[PDB]
């Protein structure tokens, strides 16, 4: 929620980014 630059989440990028934002100690299947 800041002037952050959109990262091109191509392939695995989406996955790692998803884990980063949603939460590491939880993506025990959704990643």
């Amino acid at each position: 929620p800041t002037p952050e630059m959109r990262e091109k989440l191509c392939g695995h990028h989406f996955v790692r980014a998803l884990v980063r934002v949603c939460g590491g100690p939880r993506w025990s299947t959704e990643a």
């Binding site: 959109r6 091109k8 989440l9 980063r20 949603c22 959704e30």
Partner: peptide, 26 residues
Amino acid sequence: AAATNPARYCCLSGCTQQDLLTLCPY
């Protein structure tokens, strides 16, 4: 640009933390 697919959308255009947060589930 536009894309009826988040993974594709994030790849083609790109996604931030906010963008991803909006896609975060329970």
